[PDB]
Write an enzyme that holds these catalytic residues in place. Structure first.
Site, PDB file in Angstrom:
ATOM      1  N   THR E   1       0.755  -1.309   0.000  1.00 35.19           N
ATOM      2  CA  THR E   1       0.000   0.000   0.000  1.00 35.19           C
ATOM      3  C   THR E   1       0.766   1.329   0.000  1.00 35.19           C
ATOM      4  O   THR E   1       1.895   1.419   0.480  1.00 35.19           O
ATOM      5  CB  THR E   1      -0.849   0.068   1.270  1.00 35.19           C
ATOM      6  OG1 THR E   1      -1.718  -1.005   1.228  1.00 35.19           O
ATOM      7  CG2 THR E   1      -1.764   1.289   1.393  1.00 35.19           C
TER       8      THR E   1
HETATM    9  C1  LIG Z   1      -0.066  -2.544   0.357  1.00 33.27           C
HETATM   10  C2  LIG Z   1      -0.750  -3.143  -0.899  1.00 33.27           C
HETATM   11  C3  LIG Z   1       0.874  -3.661   0.812  1.00 33.27           C
HETATM   12  O1  LIG Z   1       1.748  -3.067   1.776  1.00 33.27           O
HETATM   13  C4  LIG Z   1      -1.139  -2.236   1.530  1.00 33.27           C
HETATM   14  O2  LIG Z   1      -0.474  -2.191   2.806  1.00 33.27           O
HETATM   15  C5  LIG Z   1      -2.374  -3.149   1.668  1.00 33.27           C
HETATM   16  C6  LIG Z   1      -3.387  -2.447   2.573  1.00 33.27           C
HETATM   17  C7  LIG Z   1      -4.710  -2.899   2.379  1.00 33.27           C
HETATM   18  C8  LIG Z   1      -5.666  -2.430   3.283  1.00 33.27           C
HETATM   19  C9  LIG Z   1      -7.005  -2.803   3.175  1.00 33.27           C
HETATM   20  C10 LIG Z   1      -7.408  -3.652   2.150  1.00 33.27           C
HETATM   21  C11 LIG Z   1      -6.465  -4.121   1.240  1.00 33.27           C
HETATM   22  C12 LIG Z   1      -5.131  -3.752   1.350  1.00 33.27           C
HETATM   23  N1  LIG Z   1      -2.028  -4.394   2.333  1.00 33.27           N
HETATM   24  C13 LIG Z   1      -2.137  -5.584   1.748  1.00 33.27           C
HETATM   25  O3  LIG Z   1      -2.485  -5.792   0.589  1.00 33.27           O
HETATM   26  C14 LIG Z   1      -1.728  -6.711   2.661  1.00 33.27           C
HETATM   27  C15 LIG Z   1      -0.227  -6.701   2.756  1.00 33.27           C
HETATM   28  C16 LIG Z   1       0.071  -7.645   3.736  1.00 33.27           C
HETATM   29  C17 LIG Z   1       0.414  -8.946   3.372  1.00 33.27           C
HETATM   30  C18 LIG Z   1       0.705  -9.889   4.350  1.00 33.27           C
HETATM   31  C19 LIG Z   1       0.650  -9.530   5.696  1.00 33.27           C
HETATM   32  O4  LIG Z   1       0.941 -10.450   6.655  1.00 33.27           O
HETATM   33  C20 LIG Z   1       2.168 -10.116   7.326  1.00 33.27           C
HETATM   34  C21 LIG Z   1       0.304  -8.231   6.062  1.00 33.27           C
HETATM   35  C22 LIG Z   1       0.016  -7.289   5.083  1.00 33.27           C
HETATM   36  N2  LIG Z   1      -2.203  -7.988   2.122  1.00 33.27           N
HETATM   37  C23 LIG Z   1      -3.124  -8.704   2.780  1.00 33.27           C
HETATM   38  O5  LIG Z   1      -3.647  -8.368   3.844  1.00 33.27           O
HETATM   39  C24 LIG Z   1      -3.498 -10.018   2.121  1.00 33.27           C
HETATM   40  C25 LIG Z   1      -2.980 -11.186   2.964  1.00 33.27           C
HETATM   41  N3  LIG Z   1      -4.952 -10.110   2.049  1.00 33.27           N
HETATM   42  C26 LIG Z   1      -5.604 -10.080   0.884  1.00 33.27           C
HETATM   43  O6  LIG Z   1      -5.058  -9.983  -0.212  1.00 33.27           O
HETATM   44  C27 LIG Z   1      -7.111 -10.241   1.068  1.00 33.27           C
HETATM   45  N4  LIG Z   1      -7.873 -10.086  -0.164  1.00 33.27           N
HETATM   46  C28 LIG Z   1      -7.448 -10.937  -1.302  1.00 33.27           C
HETATM   47  C29 LIG Z   1      -8.492 -10.858  -2.345  1.00 33.27           C
HETATM   48  O7  LIG Z   1      -9.747 -11.310  -1.818  1.00 33.27           O
HETATM   49  C30 LIG Z   1     -10.251 -10.415  -0.815  1.00 33.27           C
HETATM   50  C31 LIG Z   1      -9.250 -10.425   0.277  1.00 33.27           C
END
Ligand SMILES: *[C@@](C)(CO)[C@](*)(O)[C@H](Cc1ccccc1)NC(=O)[C@H](Cc1ccc(OC)cc1)NC(=O)[C@@H](C)NC(=O)CN1CCOCC1
Ligand SMILES: [Mg+2]
Lengths: 244, 195, 235, 240, 211, 231, 222, 233
Positions: E1
């Protein structure tokens, strides 16, 4: 079930009084008279032991005057056993305060804490209240010399001079008559003993029927000394004031 | 956070605290006030782990303010420092300790004396003429050892404090974004808006 | 003495029946449900002229689509309102939608009989819960301390309830407008109240699908009172 | 634990314990609250049966809950300390969680809630206390005066009195206090508060306590001499 | 993000990207990282998507209850603190949530940064996420208090674009919000692919990139 | 008299008056009828209103796809007991992938009600229940009393004036038991049975409540114009 | 040390139409390099015109579905047989997943159905509860293989209109159920070729206003 | 969390036209030590179900007792305990699956792999697997441990899919099971020659065979094998 046998110690009368508190006060009115007199240069605590015996070991005996810490003492009127429960709690509270803030506990704060414990027994728990009235004599650097009283209701008030126990009505009138604001400890000592001598139910006031204590700045320089009088010392002050 | 300094002069206590707040590799803020007024004549600066610092400071603040209202009386700096120490000594053996170091600068209205207390997260209390936490003391104590007198004025205290910050700014690898300076004296607490 | 959860020989819980007597001593509250909305009105009943009447809050918002009026020991209602508001917003959290008025009322009524030797006694207050949802439309419920709730087209609770209910019996019909309902609540309140009805000692409120739950201003109610007086003098 | 239901309904729909708690309030010393245009004054009776009292250290009848809110009461003195302590804890708890001091209405609602809780909880009796809560909301110059009672109901008042002979002083306030034009100054507000207590108090010496609360955390307690001047001026005008 | 938000003369701008990742795999091209708590309150999301969604929707429950009890909208300061207090309960339990609470209240426009450590910072400008450094570069050099609504919206838009370009874990699209005293205003979803080429031509920037 | 202050006290003749007083609450309640054949089981309930502006209090509650009951007495107690049944039916499904036997459901209600009759502080349930269901052993009808007594029956009725309907079913026993593969005729017999308990009032469209369960019929409740067919 | 988690493979695919939705999943269940079952249903009709599939660790997937089915049942009891809308189900599932934030259901969940305007809806979840409505989504083992194909063939990404040369995009038509099922079958046939955990069978659940319909197709068994 | 101590190896099973067959050897291994030779790992529940268990034997004995208590509890206040309300294979399985998944969720698993084989009331064949993780699946053939790797391939040549079940007789199915047990004895170092076999048929009921031995083994060709490459003598 058990409800049948519950006296319900924490309820109002139709008149808005707490039965058990009022009856506890009735108990206390039969206890030996305790008097506290606050002067400009100290505080006096005087108390009458109840119909003693010749075989009672007086020098090791303590039923009226107790030490809470080096600055604060109490005179007891009522059930001695109940008073010792509260006294030990107050001693702990004073030490908790000293450990926390590294300063001796202000008199009122200690008094309020004990009075809150008494209050709790009148509002919740279903237990009988403590049949005890205290006179607190103490000193701290904020208000200086202070006299307080607390009773089973958990209500406390500050005083220049006060009595608890038996014949408080008569005793309070005598104190109100002879007390003055510029009074000193030596004069207060005399007033306390004279008041007991007139209000006592006993034939004559003697050393073996008395407990006596003073809190004086009459300690070497800016500090306070507690003096719990010994039997021989009570005998001397009785002769000095001209009672025996 | 990083640098918090304290100096007790003749008639006041001066606390200097850095303004920087860093998350990851980015400095989020360069105007952060790392301090809380516990009472009208008692100020506490703090430094330690993220989040814990403010939570602890505000918790202490609430307790002292509660005491003030209950007794209609201001606790002495010594009493406040002892209360804070006990909370930290209580905290160090908890499941998750509060990783917070503090300086407590207060003016005792009874004794008419400024007082500076240094307390670390373990509950290690010491009363000092000047103090610091973390690495701050490594750079600044030699200057303070040399220049400090107990009869210094507030203005001389500020000048010696400037010299300490200048040394920190020269020899620390860390950009702490200057300091907010606050003075605690008989009239209360005030901030030096130009430093 | 005797158990708090004791049955009488007639098969009623003593305490529940006694709490109903406390509700009869309460100030009058009236609710009227129509197809254009539900109107809620209450008697404030200030004990003294120095009491600032606008601080008397006997009509209360639970959610945007649900309102509530109370009668009896009104202090008991605060925890019921708090629970209702929590239940309403919590369901919105769990299901991303408004909660049904009946479901909200049921949640409040589940607290009712949670007393024994839980709280020490039943609630001494009755509630008129009015609201709107998409499934059953405009609804008015009467929640009692027995744990029972009836839906009503119109209902009066409090000291002048049986007199007001008899009046609501004759006056209510299925084609009532919102304006007609407002005047009808004011009319019946004025009839059962001890003191003379005005904007300061009586309060109106309504719930519509568009605007949601609204408590009426004293200026707005004053006009409806003046409109009432003129139409009664018209014949 | 002791779970006994002490506050219960009677056949006529009354909770006697709550009603007997009001009788304890009736016994308590008189307390009065009057709000002016830019202030609120809290007056309190001190019964003169207790002399040889140390007025420095004796618990004052008016208590600060926060720097901008005060609380006076009528009824059991020991009971009032519990409500005051709880109120003070909540006031700091509110500042800590919401970063604003409590409004007077919020603080009143909390204290009233505590009183209510003690009317339908097992093993406890109601507080034999009615309170007058007064102050000014943060960054607001509108005076606030509320009343609570053992049942837990609360409401706002232009002027109110509680305690013994409160019926008489309320009678006085109802005819003397004008809503369209309240006491414009501090003097007029204090004067009306002292006058109202003089209907009941007995002697105007140390029996009357006055506490003025003004906006922006400006709270002061009047001394004996300051009050005595009001007592003198009132009676001199009365001799006519 | 990448997320950002900043106060200015005419309220507060809030801009976020829309990418989501699971390792090097782009799991989502279009995720909403802004929550509409109420008409005058916004919340940005950076970190664990689940943590961000659960706790900020729970914040909205708690902010709604505030309105019902007090008959008044919660302040931005109080809302941000409720959230920071939630974070302090699950202190050290492994939550990952970086958020900016944006809104308008009595004190005017409000902006608070809150993270999983229980940190709560007031300020005029913030940026969170893997690409915050790129966004700060554009923000710091072009930000003024005297910005017009049009120029301010573009700044937040352009700042996200900068991050989306350079940061591998930022991109997809830009979501814009403008908070006023009459509430927030959504200024649409902007695909970065299309926006990049448009900005390149109109602005003359990204000269090194060929198009 | 002196032995009716709580549920924990036997009278000198061995009676439990609080339980008997709870039983009295059922007699005050509105009439409800239960009856079954070999294929289907039917509940018929006369709903009661507060007044003409009020709705008619619901009498029938669904517990599972294959089980449900009708209530007479304190409605909140029926909600508590029906909620318990829902949980027990649901525990059987989730843990054992097994539909709860109606007989076992009765045993669970008996035991739950019993605990309230032997302990101090609590009170007996102030409601009677008629449970119908279709399980592996066919159609069933149970009668629950808050004393704890549960009884499996071909037909029955509880509530005010229930004796009239109960006598009718006792005469019709041989007829309605044979109504197999005909839900409408079984309901008719139930509607005719509950009609024997009516005085002054008659069965209207928002007054009558009917429920049915059977071989290829999930537990379904009929109210409003859905029961106009049977009036 | 005991590992409470496992990987049962499989892949799922949800596509939302204009007035319909599909939820497809392969029927193969595996551990490591072994096949447990060639036909173990993974997509379920949960009631109220909602279909659900929890892909990843089968034990946690079966537990979640079982809990959601239960949640639907209690939603009827508590709210007068009201129909659980797809958006309400999605929010409910978020709370089911986050109840286990510190010991997660190790599954990627998808639900499909119709929104309250009758349009096709697909919702996507992560193991800890983050969700979002989408138009299409592949989850599980071969999700990275399939999703780019759907970006290209469903949302017409990187596809422009000939002659314009990148100036005008391909317009976003809406697909028919017959066109969608082709993309589903080709997606799984392609995934079966290049992913060892995908194969054996394909089961598709189609949701319309008329109800839930099933379609089964054989896949390669190697 | 634990580790398995005394263990039982493969349990194999398959469906046939009128029922199910299940088999398991009688060995209780203590690591590499073939410690206990008289261990029954097929446990009948009524006359319609056989639960085959592999893995930790102490946990097996615990499960054996849960099932014995399940039968006792089902008979309580149940006049139809030996008829309509008798325990079904699906009830027994779901119970075990509930227990297994709960135990793994407390990080204190029953270190087992279980196959519940039986015939339902309606005559339908029941065959489902559950293990220490609470993972469940069903197939025409099921096997645990080594059986999964070696037996399933052989049994799937007989019943490759659902449509092959009605074409498979009890003689063919039993023959396949017995051959699979021989193959496991050749190749599983933690197996024994002695085994038990159970057949649950919808017509002939439960047939429980004990003290079966692997026979018709091929070893003669070993005489010709000499050295490991170049050795001739
Ligand atoms: C950027 C893209 C990455 O740093 C940003 O922080 C986003 C923030 C965000 C907030 C709200 C909604 C969506 C995104 N973060 C993510 O994309 C996180 C990054 C992350 C990955 C792994 C982690 O564990 C240590 C922590 C943070 N990704 C996720 O949370 C990811 C695991 N979830 C999803 O992709 C869930 N989605 C996938 C598609 O179907 C719906 C749910
Ligand atoms: Mg493959």
């Amino acid at each position: 079930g058990s409800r049948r046998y519950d006296s319900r110690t924490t309820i109002f009368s139709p008149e808005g009084r707490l039965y058990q508190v009022e009856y506890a006060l009735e108990s206390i009115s039969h206890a030996g008279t305790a008097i506290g007199i606050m002067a400009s240069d100290g505080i006096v605590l005087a108390a009458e032991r109840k119909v003693t015996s010749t075989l009672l070991e007086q020098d090791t005996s303590t039923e009226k005057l107790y030490k809470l810490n080096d600055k604060i003492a109490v005179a007891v009127a009522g059930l001695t056993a109940d008073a010792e429960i509260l006294i030990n709690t107050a001693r702990i509270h004073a030490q908790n305060y000293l450990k926390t803030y590294n300063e001796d506990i202000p008199v009122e704060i200690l008094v309020r804490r004990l009075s809150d414990i008494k209050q709790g027994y009148t509002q919740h728990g279903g237990l009988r209240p403590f049949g005890v009235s205290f006179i607190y004599a103490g000193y701290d650097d904020r208000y200086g010399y202070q006299l307080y009283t607390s009773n089973p209701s958990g209500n406390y008030t500050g005083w220049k001079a006060i009595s608890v126990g038996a014949n408080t009505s008569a005793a309070q009138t005598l104190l109100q008559m002879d007390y003055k604001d510029d009074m000193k400890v030596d004069d207060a000592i005399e007033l306390a003993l004279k008041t007991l001598s007139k209000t006592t139910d006993s034939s004559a006031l003697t050393y073996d029927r008395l407990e006596f204590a003073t809190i004086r700045k009459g300690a070497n320089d800016g500090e306070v000394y507690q003096k719990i009088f010994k039997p021989q010392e009570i005998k001397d002050i009785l002769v000095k004031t001209g009672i025996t | 956070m990083d640098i918090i300094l304290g100096i007790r002069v003749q008639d006041s206590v001066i606390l200097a605290s850095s303004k920087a707040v860093t998350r990851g590799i980015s400095v989020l803020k360069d105007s952060d006030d790392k301090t809380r007024q516990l009472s009208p004549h008692t100020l506490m600066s703090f430094a330690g782990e993220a989040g814990d610092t403010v939570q602890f400071a505000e918790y202490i603040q609430a307790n002292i303010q509660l005491y003030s209202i209950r007794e209609d009386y201001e606790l002495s700096p010594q009493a406040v420092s002892s209360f804070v120490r006990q909370e930290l000594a209580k905290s160090i053996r908890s499941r998750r300790p509060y990783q917070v170091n503090v300086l407590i600068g207060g003016y005792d209205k009874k004794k008419n004396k400024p007082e500076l207390y240094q307390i670390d997260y373990l509950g290690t209390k010491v009363e000092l003429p000047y103090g610091a936490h973390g690495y701050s003391g490594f750079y600044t104590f030699s200057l303070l050892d040399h220049h400090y007198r107990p009869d210094m004025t507030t203005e001389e205290g500020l000048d010696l404090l400037k010299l300490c910050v200048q040394e920190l700014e020269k020899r620390m690898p860390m950009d702490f974004k200057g300091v907010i300076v606050k003075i605690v004296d008989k009239d209360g607490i005030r901030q030096v808006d130009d430093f | 003495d005797r158990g708090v959860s004791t049955f009488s020989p007639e098969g009623r819980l003593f305490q529940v029946e006694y709490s109903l007597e406390a509700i009869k001593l309460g100030s009058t509250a009236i609710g009227i449900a129509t197809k254009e909305g539900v109107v809620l009105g209450v008697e404030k009943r200030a004990t003294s002229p120095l009491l600032e009447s606008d601080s008397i809050e006997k009509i209360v918002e639970i959610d945007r689509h649900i309102g509530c009026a109370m009668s009896g020991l009104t202090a008991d209602a605060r925890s019921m309102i708090e629970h209702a508001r929590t239940a309403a917003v919590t369901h919105n959290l769990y299901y991303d939608e408004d909660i049904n008025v009946e479901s909200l009322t049921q949640s409040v009524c589940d607290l009712a009989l949670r007393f024994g030797e839980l709280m020490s006694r039943p609630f001494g207050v009755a509630l008129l819960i009015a609201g709107h949802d998409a499934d059953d439309g405009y609804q008015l419920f009467h929640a009692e301390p027995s744990g029972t709730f009836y839906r009503y087209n119109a209902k009066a609770i409090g000291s002048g309830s049986e007199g007001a209910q008899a009046e609501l019996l004759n006056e209510w019909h299925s084609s009532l407008t919102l304006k007609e309902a407002e005047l009808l609540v004011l009319k019946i309140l004025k009839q059962v109240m001890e003191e003379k009805l005005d904007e300061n000692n009586a309060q109106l409120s309504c719930i519509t699908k568009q605007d949601g739950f609204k408590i009426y201003d004293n200026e707005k109610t004053a006009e409806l009172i003046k409109e009432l007086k003129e139409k009664e003098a018209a014949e | 634990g002791y779970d006994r239901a002490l506050s219960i309904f009677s056949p006529d729909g009354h909770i006697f314990q709550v009603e007997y708690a009001l009788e304890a309030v009736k016994r308590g010393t008189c307390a009065v609250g009057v709000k002016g245009k830019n202030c609120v004054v809290l007056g309190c009776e001190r019964r003169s049966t207790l002399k040889l009292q140390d007025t420095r250290i004796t618990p004052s009848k008016v208590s600060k809950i926060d720097s901008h809110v005060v609380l006076s009461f009528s009824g059991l003195n020991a009971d009032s300390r519990i409500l005051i302590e709880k109120a003070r804890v909540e006031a700091q708890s509110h500042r800590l969680t919401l970063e604003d001091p409590v409004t007077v209405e919020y603080l009143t609602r909390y204290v009233a809630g505590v009183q209510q809780r003690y009317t339908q909880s097992g093993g406890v009796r109601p507080f034999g206390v009615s309170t007058l809560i007064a102050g000014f909301d943060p960054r607001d110059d509108e005076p606030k005066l509320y009343q609570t009672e053992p049942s837990g109901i609360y409401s706002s008042w232009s002027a109110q009195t509680i305690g013994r002979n409160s019926k008489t002083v309320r009678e006085f306030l109802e005819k003397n206090y004008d809503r369209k034009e309240p006491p414009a100054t501090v003097e007029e507000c204090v004067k009306l508060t002292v006058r109202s207590l003089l209907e009941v108090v007995q002697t105007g010496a140390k029996n009357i306590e006055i506490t003025v609360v003004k906006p922006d955390s400006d709270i002061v307690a009047l001394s004996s001499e300051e009050i005595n001047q009001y007592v003198t001026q009132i009676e001199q005008e009365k001799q006519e | 993000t990448t997320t950002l938000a900043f106060k200015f003369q005419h309220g507060v701008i809030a801009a976020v990207d829309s990418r989501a990742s699971a390792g090097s795999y782009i799991s989502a091209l279009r995720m909403n990282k802004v929550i509409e708590i109420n008409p005058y309150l916004l919340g940005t999301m950076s970190g664990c998507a689940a943590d961000c969604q659960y706790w900020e929707r729970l914040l909205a429950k708690e902010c709604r209850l505030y309105y019902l009890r007090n008959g008044e909208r919660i302040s931005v300061s109080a809302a941000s603190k409720l959230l920071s207090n939630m974070m302090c309960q699950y202190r050290g339990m492994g939550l990952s949530m970086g958020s900016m609470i944006c809104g308008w209240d009595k004190k005017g426009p409000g902006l608070y940064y809150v993270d999983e450590h229980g940190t709560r910072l007031s300020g005029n400008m913030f940026s969170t996420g893997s690409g915050n450094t790129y966004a700060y570069g554009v923000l710091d050099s072009n930000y003024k208090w005297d910005l017009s609504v049009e120029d301010a919206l573009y700044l937040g838009k352009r700042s996200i674009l900068a991050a989306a370009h350079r940061d591998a874990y930022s991109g997809g699209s830009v979501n814009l919000y403008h908070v006023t005293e009459d509430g927030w205003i959504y200024h649409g979803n902007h695909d970065v692919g299309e926006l990049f080429w448009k900005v390149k031509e109109e602005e003359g920037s990204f000269n090194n990139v060929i198009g | 008299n002196n032995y009716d202050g709580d549920t924990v006290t036997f009278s000198p003749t061995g009676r439990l008056f609080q339980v008997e007083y709870a039983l009295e609450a059922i007699k005050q309640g509105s009439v409800t009828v239960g009856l079954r054949s070999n294929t289907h089981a039917v509940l018929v309930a006369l709903k009661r209103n507060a007044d003409e502006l009020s709705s008619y209090q619901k009498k029938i509650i669904k517990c599972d796809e294959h089980m449900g009951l009708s209530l007479a007495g304190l409605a909140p107690d029926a909600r508590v007991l029906s909620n318990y049944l829902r949980q027990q039916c649901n525990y059987s499904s989730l843990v054992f992938n097994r539909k709860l036997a109606v007989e076992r459901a009765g045993h669970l209600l008996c035991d739950k009600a019993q605990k309230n009759t032997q302990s101090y502080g609590g009170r007996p349930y102030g409601v009677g229940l008629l449970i119908i269901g279709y399980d592996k052993s066919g159609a069933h009808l149970l009668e629950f009393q808050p004393s704890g007594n549960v009884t499996e029956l071909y037909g029955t009725a509880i509530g005010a004036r229930s004796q009239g309907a109960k006598t009718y079913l006792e005469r019709t026993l041989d007829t309605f038991i044979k109504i197999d593969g005909n839900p409408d005729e079984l309901i008719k017999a139930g509607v005719e049975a509950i009609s024997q308990s009516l005085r002054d009032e008659s069965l209207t469209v928002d007054n009558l409540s009917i429920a049915i369960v059977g071989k290829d019929t999930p537990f379904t409740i009929y109210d409003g114009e859905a029961v106009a067919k049977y009036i | 040390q005991f590992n409470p988690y496992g990987d049962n493979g499989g892949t799922i695919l949800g596509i939302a139409g204009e007035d319909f939705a599909v939820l497809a999943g392969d029927t193969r269940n595996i551990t490591d390099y072994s096949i447990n079952s060639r036909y173990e249903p993974k997509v379920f009709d949960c009631g109220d015109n909602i279909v659900m599939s929890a892909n990843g660790f089968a034990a946690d997937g079966d537990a979640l579905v079982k809990r959601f089915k239960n949640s639907v049942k209690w939603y009827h009891f508590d709210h007068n047989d009201k129909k659980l809308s797809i958006n309400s189900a999605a929010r409910n599932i978020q709370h089911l997943l986050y109840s286990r934030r510190f010991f997660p259901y190790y599954v990627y969940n998808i639900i499909a159905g119709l929104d309250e305007d009758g349009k096709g809806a697909v919702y996507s979840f992560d193991p800890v509860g983050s969700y979002q409505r989408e138009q299409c989504r592949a989850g599980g083992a071969a999700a990275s293989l399939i999703m780019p194909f759907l970006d290209n063939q469903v949302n017409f990404k990187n596809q422009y209109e000939p002659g314009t040369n990148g100036k005008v995009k391909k317009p976003l038509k809406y697909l028919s159920v017959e066109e969608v099922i082709k993309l589903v079958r080709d997606s799984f046939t392609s995934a079966t070729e290049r992913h060892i955990q995908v194969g054996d069978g394909l089961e598709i659940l189609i949701v319309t206003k008329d109800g839930v319909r099933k379609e089964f197709y054989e896949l390669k068994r190697d | 969390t634990q580790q398995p101590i005394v263990t039982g190896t493969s349990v194999i099973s398959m469906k046939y036209d009128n029922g199910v067959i299940i088999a398991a050897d009688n060995l209780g291994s203590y690591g590499s030590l073939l410690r206990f030779n008289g261990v029954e790992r097929l446990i009948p529940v009524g006359d319609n179900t056989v639960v085959g268990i592999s893995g930790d034997i102490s946990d097996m004995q615990h499960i054996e007792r849960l099932l014995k208590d399940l039968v006792t509890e089902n008979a309580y206040d149940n006049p139809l305990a030996d008829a309509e309300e008798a325990l079904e294979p699906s009830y027994i399985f779901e119970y075990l699956a509930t227990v297994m998944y709960q135990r793994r969720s407390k990080m204190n698993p029953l270190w087992n792999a279980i196959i519940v084989a039986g015939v339902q009331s309606n005559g339908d064949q029941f065959l489902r697997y559950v293990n220490l993780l609470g993972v469940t699946y069903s197939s025409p053939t099921l096997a645990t441990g080594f059986g999964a790797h070696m037996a399933n391939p052989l049994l799937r040549k007989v019943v490759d899919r659902e449509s092959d079940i009605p074409k498979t007789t009890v003689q063919v199915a039993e023959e396949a099971i017995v051959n699979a047990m021989r193959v496991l004895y050749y190749r599983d170092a933690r197996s024994s020659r002695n085994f038990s076999l159970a057949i649950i048929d919808k017509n002939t009921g439960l047939t429980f065979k004990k003290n079966l031995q692997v026979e018709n083994m091929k070893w003669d060709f070993a005489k010709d094998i000499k050295g490991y490459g170049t050795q001739k003598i």
